[PDB]
Nucleic acid binder design. Structure first.
Ligand SMILES: [Mg+2]
Ligand SMILES: [Mg+2]
Lengths: 97, 98, 94, 146, 56, 113, 223, 231
DNA sequence: GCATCCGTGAGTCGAGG
RNA sequence: CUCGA
């Protein structure tokens, strides 16, 4: 945030809206400045987030952060399979598996 | 780190020394004894499950290395640390049923 | 849901009878190249191609839509089977 | 020639060739089983005036849904140094095919805390929720999973 | 051969599936609703798309 | 969208004339959705301050940020003066348009919950 | 990518569905959202901004001889659809005097030059034997939605400020569906639905909206 | 009472970063204008990208080069970061040549100069060459838009060429600020600030301009209505 | 009228090898 | 057998 205030930008209108909602949610203490409240939220691990489709903020502050996620060996490329007709079994004459 | 080390994924310096050669295929190290030890690097090898087994050199020519220092990262290794995935920026929220 | 499914279910004493009627009718349409349809040209089910609206190839869709008109008759023992076959062959040859 | 394009002189796909489902990896011919040509085959043969070949196509092809780049070939032949195959086997050919798999819809992701799920949607960057500084998030996890 | 497959055959495929349904089945099939019929919509990608209200 | 706000700032204050309630709210002494008692009947500031002629007006007000979906408010719907939130009206309309029958849809849903 | 076909479907002067396809991936919501915002806030209309009623002090009073309370009458005045025929005109005052057993409609309002009432059959109030209604209603031109206590206009002391529903557009809804062109797979299909009051048609409302947006785009010109 | 044309301010830092202010705007227009521009800036701005790579004595991406520390996959990963500016609008494709050898850390600078072609990030590391290490590359860079995977374009100048994933977009980041402002007695008016980060291939201002143009052109599409043939 | 030995069942599909 | 639901 200090970077933002240094770059010459104040608090956003949408951020103010989210802060109002957050005050209603009991997430921030009423009376404090926008920066203090945003800081409270951030300390709760929450930030203001904008919907990329509308540019309007999500009505509540959202938990955002780095997470370690792995891609598992179960890939759909190895699993998708289809058959019209194909080989049949010797004795049963039923499709192979 | 212990997981990477004990699984023998990565390559480590046998003793103190200086890195003589660095290649995608091989690392040559000159130890304190004066002997030249050449470590071939396993490259794009196929494991039992078809996943890639390859070692990337993590040292440069002329680098001074001590005993047990990292020479090459194996698969799922980032500077000697177990690297099973990716660090990504996440948001915890519903999103249109997706 | 299939268009007018509630009415269709309302038309029979058993839902399975509805299925039998729809299926046999579909077969009748396929067998006679849809020439025996009770649908007026404007009531014909359509499918959007790359070119434009063409007839819907799906005979079950046709059958259900025809059933919704009331122009079809169903029941047991309406007519001997071979007589039905021969009359439909006479009116609409294959 | 289109189907044989990437095969080398000996009938083995070349290193570096991109292979797709249906493509031949190793060409192979097998002498046909004792054929008693049905009358249809005889008449057709007469019409086109072409002798039926002695051997038939039994080549190794890329299975459906597979493929990629050929990176290694191994050929073991009978009558050659260091080589002795199982009885009756003239030669064995192995082809290694590498693929670079990008994350796709249906691939399984997980964290170390037992949260797992398949990718259901890949959104363009402008559709992602973003921080006021313009930074889009990478992954959206549902709170209902907690 | 996949490289021989041209665009038009996809359009043809679209006409083939018109109005038709497929059966979707998840094991274990504990009751009849473990199999259900659906009108398929062709998609790119290799995953089947299942409606949320039928999941339960 | 169908849950309503319950607030503590007002905390059950008594008012004679509604203008006094609106005044107190303007001062910042009574919350919009706090349960108060103007005259004898129990109510709240929001139900007095915002009285909409129809669902469209209320939702237009929502779009303009005048009130939220959860704010308890007064709306005229199907010849009735309803004390409800815009969100419940929106739900009612979702059902109504889904089923193409405003009357039956009104009979089906439970609005006050 | 070939230019999209623009398709229209109207039901009188009140409702219209607008379809735009095909669009490049994402442009469905890129166009839909701004237009929706503009259509709900920037389309010029008219609205009742102030009401004076004889012998009535405040909004929560009751009128002798009239079945409706002041609140109910004001609500009905909010639904009045007034159209200004002359683009010069900014504001009008409409007078209405009636008594006895009668059901007052919007027709009853004394006509004013270049002021059209689109809904003359609109109910205002019912009066009883001896019931008397004398009212003056201020009608202004504007945009969007302005609550009573935000414009707070009064010509006299007992004039009641009314929530100003300027917007001729009652509701906007849009949806974006995936569509394809040959083997272009991720294309967008924009469908826009617009509800108006009749004073301005859905199509007219849209054309004004795209013009407002186009004009704002030209503001990125001269530093 | 109708608000009129607002002041448009431009601030720039080199070719990389730019701020674009518009004030005052009517309430809600900061988002109404800000977001569609952000969506277009992030997705539809044409640019340049390495689309193909040929390396001598290399048959495919899954390889190593004698005397080179990096494997081919890593080298291509590095080349995906190459920012190339075309001075001539007509120029659609360029083949950069790199001939290097001996002990050295090859940078993007080492590409042979080409008329009307500038490398915006010449300090970009490409490969570490050892004693006896040689590297002879031909990289094909094309004009394009959006994200085009190697699997989709399959561009190969020669038989052993390696298709490269193409991220054409020259726009690195976009944010926008909506701040409270006033004019005369009007309150709750919008001050809009577009913050644009590009790679230097095209300037933030150029990007803003062609984004605006794209949006305007899309607005043109509402010009010719058509009756629905559904009935 | 009651303990003892024997024969028989014990979810699905899917994957690898 | 091991893995998956
Ligand atoms: Mg009010
Ligand atoms: Mg799409």
């Amino acid at each position: 945030f200090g970077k933002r205030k240094g770059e010459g930008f104040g608090v956003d209108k949408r951020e103010v809206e989210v802060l109002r909602r957050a005050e209603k949610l009991g997430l921030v203490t009423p009376g404090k400045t926008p920066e203090e409240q945003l800081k409270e939220l951030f300390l709760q691990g929450k930030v203001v987030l904008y919907d990329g489709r509308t540019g309007e903020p999500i009505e509540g502050p959202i938990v955002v952060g780095q997470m370690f996620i792995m891609k598992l060996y179960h890939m759909v490329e190895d699993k998708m399979h289809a058959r019209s007709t194909g080989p049949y079994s010797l004795i049963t004459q039923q499709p192979l598996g | 780190e212990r997981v990477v080390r004990d699984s023998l994924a990565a390559l480590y310096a046998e003793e103190d020394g200086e890195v003589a050669k660095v290649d995608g295929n091989r690392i040559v190290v000159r130890y304190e004894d004066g002997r030249l030890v050449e470590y071939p690097l396993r490259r794009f090898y196929r494991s039992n499950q078809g996943t890639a087994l390859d070692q990337r050199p993590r040292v440069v020519v002329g680098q001074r290395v001590r005993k047990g220092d990292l020479l090459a990262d194996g698969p799922a290794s980032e500077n000697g640390f177990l690297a099973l995935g990716q660090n990504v920026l996440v948001a915890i929220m519903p999103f249109d049923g997706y | 849901a299939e268009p007018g499914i509630d009415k269709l279910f309302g038309m029979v004493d058993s839902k399975y009878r509805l299925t039998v009627v729809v299926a046999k009718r579909a077969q009748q349409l396929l067998r006679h190249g849809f020439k025996n349809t009770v649908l007026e040209p404007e009531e014909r089910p359509k499918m959007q191609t790359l070119e434009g609206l063409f007839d819907d190839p799906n005979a079950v869709t046709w059958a259900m839509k025809e059933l919704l008109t009331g122009r079809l008759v169903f029941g047991e023992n309406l007519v001997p089977e071979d007589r039905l076959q021969k009359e439909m062959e006479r009116l609409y040859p294959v | 020639e289109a189907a044989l394009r990437d095969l080398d002189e000996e009938g083995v796909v070349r290193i570096g060739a991109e292979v797709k489902p249906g493509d031949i990896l190793v060409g192979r011919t097998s002498f046909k089983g004792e054929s008693e040509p049905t009358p249809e085959e005889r008449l057709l043969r007469s019409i086109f005036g072409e002798k039926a070949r002695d051997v038939k196509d039994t080549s190794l092809r890329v299975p459906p849904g597979e493929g990629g780049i050929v990176v290694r070939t191994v050929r073991l032949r009978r009558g050659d140094p260091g080589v002795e195959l199982k009885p009756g086997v003239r030669e064995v050919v192995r082809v290694y095919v590498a693929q670079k798999r990008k994350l796709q819809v249906g691939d399984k992701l997980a964290n170390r805390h037992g949260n797992k799920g398949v990718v259901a949607k890949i959104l363009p960057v402008e559709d992602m929720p973003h921080l006021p500084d313009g930074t889009p998030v990478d992954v959206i996890l549902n709170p209902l999973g907690v | 051969r996949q490289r021989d497959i041209k665009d038009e055959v996809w359009d043809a495929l679209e006409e083939v599936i018109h109005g038709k349904v497929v059966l979707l089945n998840r094991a274990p099939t504990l009751h009849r609703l473990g199999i259900q019929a659906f009108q398929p919509v062709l998609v790119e990608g290799q995953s089947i798309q299942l409606h949320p209200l039928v999941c339960e | 969208i169908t849950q309503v706000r319950k607030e503590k700032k007002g905390a059950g204050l008594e008012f004679a004339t509604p203008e006094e309630a609106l005044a107190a709210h303007e001062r910042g002494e009574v919350a919009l959705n706090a349960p108060i008692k103007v005259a004898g009947r129990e109510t709240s500031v929001g139900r007095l301050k915002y009285v909409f002629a129809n669902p469209d007006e209320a939702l237009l007000a929502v779009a303009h940020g005048i009130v939220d979906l959860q704010d308890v408010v007064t709306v005229r719907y199907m010849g009735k003066r309803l004390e409800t939130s815009p969100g419940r009206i929106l739900f009612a309309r979702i059902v109504a348009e889904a089923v193409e029958d405003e009357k039956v849809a009104w009979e089906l849903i439970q609005l006050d919950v | 990518l070939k230019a999209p076909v623009f398709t229209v479907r109207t039901q009188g002067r009140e409702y219209g569905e607008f379809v735009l396809e095909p669009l490049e991936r994402g442009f469905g919501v890129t166009l839909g959202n701004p237009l929706r915002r503009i259509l709900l806030s920037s389309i010029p209309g008219t609205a009742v901004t102030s009401v004076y009623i004889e012998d009535v002090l405040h909004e929560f009073s009751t009128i002798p001889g009239v079945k409706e309370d002041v609140v109910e009458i004001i609500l009905n005045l909010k639904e009045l659809v007034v159209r200004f025929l002359n683009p010069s005109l900014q504001t009008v005052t409409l007078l209405l005097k009636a008594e006895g057993p009668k059901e007052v409609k919007a027709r009853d309002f004394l006509p004013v030059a270049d002021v059209e009432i689109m809904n003359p059959d609109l109910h205002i109030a019912t009066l009883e034997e001896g019931g008397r209604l004398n009212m003056e209603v201020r009608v202004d031109r504007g945009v969007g939605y302005v609550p009573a206590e935000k414009h707070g206009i009064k010509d006299r002391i007992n004039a009641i400020p009314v929530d100003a529903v300027f917007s001729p557009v009652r509701r906007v809804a849009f949806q974006v569906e995936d569509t394809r062109l040959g083997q272009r797979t991720d294309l967008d299909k924009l469908t826009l639905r617009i509800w108006t009051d009749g004073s301005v048609t859905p199509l007219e409302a849209l054309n004004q909206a795209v013009e407002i947006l186009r004009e704002h785009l030209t503001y990125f010109s001269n530093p």
